[PDB]
Symmetry: C4
Subunit: 323 residues, 4 copies
């Protein structure tokens, strides 16, 4: 059942797979919005939203597995058989599999690994208790390690769609990509702000090591008598604010003053998407960072992305107007 590379089944499958990849690209950064900072100073996770996102990601991974299957069952054109553009067809399944494994299979398999799901379920909780690591909100960012190759996969595939079927197709696509970059940067900023607030809490606990340890900032122990007794005699709610000059919050300060980390899922999502869009359009200006290397590099990445994306938008609109 080898499908023709320039046939109809593969064209329809690629049309569906572009939508599936776009859905996966949209859903992956949403995993960064799960942590919630509560008024009692603790980080919880929205269970219902977590399960919903995991279900969507599982559907996307099923689609990716189907794509890998169809790529093991697709034909190719031999480079040496290209007779005036007529490269014929190859039906050898073994040759197709060898060609796929030599080039293309590795990156597609990496992109199809259910990394967020295993990280959420069978890595952090249950037997894989990372008490020694104590970086539950940091490991989520390794999704980016898988997100970056997957983002690459959107470039050639969509190009094939361009071959499948203009003036309006150069600016709308670039604005969609620009919104995607804004979405990813906003989710990254939200998770980094959560990490910054957790670091401020850890510094406060270090200042108050007499009656605190690095276990009081989890909402599963908020009702403990020790937790409330420490909370009523601590000024963590006032020290961990951008107004107080105790900890350098930097660009993450807007996540504490505006209570973004406490707001509902849609409020926080739209706030962070607008943050990313605004700091991508403004070329990273207004990102008055602290003296921390990671935040500075995040701001530099945002500025560079804004520069290249604005240049692409200007060029695309110039091309559209000239044609």
């Amino acid at each position: 059942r080898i499908f023709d590379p320039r046939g109809q089944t593969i064209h329809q499958w690629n049309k569906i797979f572009l939508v599936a990849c776009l859905i996966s690209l949209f859903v992956d950064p949403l995993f960064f919005y799960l942590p919630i900072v509560q008024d009692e100073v603790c980080i919880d996770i929205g269970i219902a939203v977590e399960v919903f996102l995991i279900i969507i990601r599982s559907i996307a991974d099923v689609f990716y597995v189907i794509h890998i299957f169809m790529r093991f069952h697709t034909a190719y054109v031999a480079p040496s058989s290209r007779v005036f553009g007529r490269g014929e067809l190859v039906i050898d399944s073994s040759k197709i599999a060898s060609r796929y494994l030599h080039k293309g299979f590795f990156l597609d398999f990496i992109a199809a690994l259910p990394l967020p799901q295993v990280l959420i379920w069978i890595v952090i909780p249950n037997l894989g208790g990372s008490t020694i690591a104590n970086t539950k909100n940091v490991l989520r960012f390794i999704i980016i390690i898988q997100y970056l190759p997957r983002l690459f996969l959107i470039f050639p595939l969509s190009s094939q769609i361009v071959k499948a079927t203009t003036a309006w197709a150069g600016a709308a696509y670039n604005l969609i990509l620009y919104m995607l970059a804004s979405h990813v940067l906003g989710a990254c900023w939200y998770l980094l702000s959560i990490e910054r607030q957790e670091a401020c809490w850890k510094s406060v606990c270090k200042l108050e090591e007499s009656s605190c340890q690095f276990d009081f900032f989890d909402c599963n122990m908020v009702k403990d008598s020790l937790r409330v007794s420490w909370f009523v005699t601590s000024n963590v709610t006032n020290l961990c604010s951008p107004n107080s000059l105790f900890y350098q919050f930097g660009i993450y300060g807007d996540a504490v003053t505006s209570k973004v980390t406490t707001s509902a899922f849609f409020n926080k999502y739209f706030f962070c998407l607008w943050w990313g869009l605004r700091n991508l359009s403004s070329l990273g200006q207004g990102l008055l960072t602290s003296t921390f290397v990671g935040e500075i590099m995040f701001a530099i990445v945002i500025a560079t992305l804004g520069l290249v994306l604005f240049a692409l938008l200007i060029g695309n609109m110039q091309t559209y107007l000239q044609s």
Copy 2:
């Protein structure tokens, strides 16, 4: 009395209609500047300015009715008779009316409906008392529901004018588009800031529900003894300020600190026009919103409009310089 589409009567009518549509597009957002926040914490409406705007709107409406009447009596080129461009003319009134009804009549009829003057006069006040809704200043935005179709009519019609009559007509036209977009965004910002201040007043009333009720911020009840007795012992004047953290004013806070909602019509109009133009040139930067989805979406729309308009301006200037 069928008019020639390429003739002189229709050309002159289109020249008049371009100016009429430009005036109508300039006047429609001005209805958002009518509400006035007075020093007694209430929202009034300038009766004289409202009457003048309704008169101008009715003039635009009768011009649109004349345009519809004229288009009911215009000839069209038969697609099947296009013999090397010479498509002749169709004179049959019934055929012309049927063709116009099939394509074109609905969208032109929508743009000619006197929706704003109906809403102001015979929808909200008098028989149609919307006491339950209590959203008098929110219904105005449904003018946008009609504004967007009308904004469409400029693009073809002006192009037709281009056919009727370059290097200087590309940058100036896009600057006019920029002015119109900034004016509309400024009017929308003014009305949304009025809504935000009214929402803060409603929150204060809820906090003081013992002596306040949800009909109490109307200027027709200012002289009431109950209202003054409540006001002399109420802290609504400082709770609904961006300085206080009682309510998240966000980007609308600049309309409370600067007191544009209480200024004269020209001052408020120019302030809001400059606000829209500045946040369109800054690509939405400086729009530090709150965690409210509507305000965030407004900021995102402003940033996207700034992106597309600046890209169009750069492309038009590049075309001008290359020509």
Copy 3:
């Protein structure tokens, strides 16, 4: 002694006239830096800098008069005698004078009028004592009335210089124009901030009509016994500051906090030039104006100039790299 329009004497005269026009365009805005706000809350005029600028403007006006004389004594090509480019020359002095008077003489004569000199010397002081008007700092802006036609003369003449003698000639020329716009806008902003501070002083005087009148803010009367007695008991020092919420300084408030109205000529000049450059590059963003129509219109003009200039710069660099 009619000179050849395609000859060498007129070529050299145009080369030196471009320099003279550039110097005159650089010098006219400097007259806006003359008023100085002193620590005694008064506005004085720097006599030495004023005299130097008047001398430079006199030299420029002499050059302009020589230019208009030479234009009265230059030949022209008859439009009806253009036989395949060989349009011959016209030597009749009467015909040349009539042609110049019909078109060209009016605006050239307008630019050659010593308006700033007569305004400074024989309009405001001496016989023309503007005691009733009391707007000495406002009249200077009618230099702009002469400045706008003069700025016109740069555009054709420079093009003629192009005909006298590339890839590098597009970016540098546009940067020179951009610097000129920044210089003019900075001088205008300095004078407007002077006017705003004087208006705040007048408002304070109105608040203190018992012991103040509209002369007390003139530095010639600073040593008056009434002046010192009012000053030792007046709070105009802190009331007219952007920190206090007494007067809406707006975008001009930055000139009071930084004390640029008091500093030396070089400091204030460079601060205002950088202000114009920054608010021209930032597309007018950060110009958070008050509810005053004049300030808002000035900010709108600055933003539109920034838009057109940045688009022109982008287009010029695109042309330079492409060619």
Copy 4:
């Protein structure tokens, strides 16, 4: 042993020399990050990082000397022997040396001088004790005096590499130049902020001439009894802050508020790099300077560099899109 100008040895040497020159351009501004402001209000020099930078710069200068020595022994195409491209080879060493001395030797020699390490070792300390000058942290900027000619050598030489080896070579090259400009501007801003804080300390000492001289702000005298006695009774810590309105810190105040001058080398380097990149992308907006001419000139230079770099980047991206 004259090398062929279009041979293989010179090609490889130029490939090495481009990397060497890039290293030298990256290392020279790092000398500006050496001064450190300590909590005892004094400026020290990191000896270890200074020695490492001196060693790297010495290696780069040895590479420059090797380049000069070898290009003394290369043939050149005779201007009069260019017979249809075949310009032959000049083997005469005397003629090659004469041509090099006439054109090429001066700029290559001035760019190979060990001026930075000479200043660090045998100019400022030891015999050349600049007690009278008292500009230990100011002289470093004369590295820029040699840096600009060395910045020139990149533009031709890199072009040769282009001749030795596209669509991706326009955006990447522009971004490399842009990052280099950001790095240089950040180093210059750090050293200028150090200078501003030192000037504030000098002003404070002038305010405290009774018990202070211009030596208490050197970290070699921090442990002196007079030093500690003055420090315990001096308020230099409060007066020399951006919050206190004592000294106009201007755009350098962000360096004191963020305590970047005290941070470690990596923190300060990345903070200053992000500062330069942000103020270069923002076209100098947000550089609210003081009334000081040097700071204003620095801001104007930053704005002009941002303008030209953004224009070049837009043009390069347009070229990439169209080709």
